[PDB]
Paper text:
Crystal structures of both [name]-7.1 and [name]-22.1 revealed multiple positively charged arginine and lysine residues in the combining sites that are likely to be important for the recognition of the phosphate groups in the phosphorylated peptide epitopes in tau, as in other structurally characterized anti-tau antibodies such as pT231/pS235_1 with phosphorylated peptide pT231/pS235, RB86 with phosphorylated peptide (416–430) and AT8 with phosphorylated peptide (202–209). Binding of both [name]-7.1 and [name]-22.1 was notably affected by ionic strength, which suggests that binding is stabilized by ionic interactions with involvement of phospho groups in both cases.
These positively charged residues create basic electrostatic pockets on the antibody surface that could play an important role in the phosphopeptide recognition. Antibody [name]-7.1 was mapped exclusively to the same peptide region as AT8, but its affinity for the doubly phosphorylated peptide at positions S202 and T205 was much lower than that of AT8 (5.8 µM vs 87.5 nM). However, binding of [name]-7.1 appeared to be more promiscuous involving not only phospho-residues on positions S202 and T205, but also combinations of S198 + S202, S198 + T205, S199 + T205, and possibly Y197 + T205. While [name]-7.1 binds the same region of tau as murine anti-PHF antibody AT8, it recognizes a slightly different epitope. In particular, [name]-7.1 appears to be more promiscuous with respect to the exact residues that need to be phosphorylated and may thus recognize a wider spectrum of phosphorylated tau species. [name]-7.1 showed staining of neurofibrillary tangles, pretangles, neuritic plaques and neuropil threads that was comparable to AT8.
Residue numbers in the entry:
A (entry chain H): 1 to 52, 52A, 53 to 82, 82A, 82B, 82C, 83 to 100, 100A, ...
B (entry chain L): 1 to 27, 27A, 28 to 214
The structure:
Amino acid sequence: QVQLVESGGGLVQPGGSLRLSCAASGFTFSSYWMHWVRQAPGKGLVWVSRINSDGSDTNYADSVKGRFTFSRDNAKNTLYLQMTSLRAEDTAIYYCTRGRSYGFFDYWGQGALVTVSSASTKGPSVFPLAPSSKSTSGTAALGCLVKDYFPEPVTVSWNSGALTSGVHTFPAVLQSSGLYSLSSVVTVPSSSLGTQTYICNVNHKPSNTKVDKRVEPKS
Amino acid sequence: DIVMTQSPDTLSLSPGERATLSCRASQIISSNYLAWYQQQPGQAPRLLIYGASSRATGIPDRFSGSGSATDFTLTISRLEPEDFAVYYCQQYGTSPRTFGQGTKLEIKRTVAAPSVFIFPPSDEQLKSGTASVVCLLNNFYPREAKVQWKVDNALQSGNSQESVTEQDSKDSTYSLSSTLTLSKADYEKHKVYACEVTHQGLSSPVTKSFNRGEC
C-alpha cells in the first residue's frame, strides 16, 4: 500500500545544514505533487514546501525560502529536502506528504525529528526501577530510568517487543542540565517475578547507543 | 495570509456523545477547499475530510464536515475512547496551505484513583554520584493530581520533575511519574523518602515511602 518513510532526522548546529529524504511506494510517484509539512514540539502544523510532479518546479513557505531546496528523483522514487543555514525555530518533526487537489495531504509519513541546537550529542544511561514483592499492590510494577541524553528521541521496548501490555513510556522532560530524561514502566504479576525475565531495550540513534537492561527485584 | 481560527481550544466529552468543532477563516475559502485532520499522540496527522464535506478513504461515517464560506464545522457524533486527539482544520485554496491551531479532544471516563509506586535509586546510579527517586501514579482520571515529596518529613520543592502520559486510547486514563533528583551525598544524609499523593478518586492522601537502604 501507499507508504512514505523519512530518513536523516537528527541534530544540527545553528547555521548548519541537514538533508532529509523520503522513500515512497504503493502508488505512481511521478503522478503526484509532494510536500513537506512540519510541526514544532507541542505546536501546530506548518506547510514547508511543494514540488510538482516532475521535480522542475517548487513553492516554499516564506520563512524557509532561499534556505531549503526541495528535489525529487523519480527513478529512485525519492524526495530530498536540503536544509541550509538552519535556525532554532526550524526545530520540528518533518512529515513527508502526498498532495491532492490544490493541496490537501491524504498520506503522511511517520516523520523525522530535526533538532537545531549548538549542544552536542549524548547517549542515555539506563538504570533499573526494580520491582518489590513487598511495596507493591493494586499487582507489581517495574521499569527503566533512561537518563541524561540529547537530543530527542529514544525508543524503549520490553523483551524486544514481546511485552507491550501495561507499558507506559513517559514523555521525556528537559532537565536543568539541558539533558533529557524519562522512565518506562510496566505493571506485571507478583507471582511471575523470579520466573519471568524483564529486559528493557533502549535505542538512541543520534548517539548510536543501544542498551539492554535486565530489571530485577533487589535482595 | 489567511488565518484559520479553531474553537474551542479544548473539549472534554463522554463516549456516545457528540462533538462539534469550529473553524473560521479570515478570507473566503474558494470552492470549498477545506480539509480536516485527526492527530493522535505520537502519530502523523490523518486526513478525515476534504472539500469541506467529503470523507477521506477508510474514514467512518460518524465524522461529517459542513460549512461554506468562512464558517466550517466538524461533527463527531458517537465518540469512542479512540477519538481522543487534536483536530486540525486546513485551507488549501492558497499558499501557504494554512492550518488552524487545533481543538484538543479529551474523552471522559469514570473517576479512577491512581495506584502509587515508589522506586529508590539503583545501586548503579549511586556509584555515578546522583540519586533519582521515582514516584509512579498509574492509570488515573481525571488528569489533575498532586504529588508532594518528603525527605525525613521535610517537604521538598524545586528538585523534582513531572511527566504525564497522553490519555490512553482504550481505557482513557493517564499515568504520571514524579522524579526527585538529589546528589549522592544528600541522598545518604537522610533516611525516609516519601511520596504523598492527592487525587479526586482517593478519599484521603496516599503515601508511599521507603527507608534508604532497607531490603
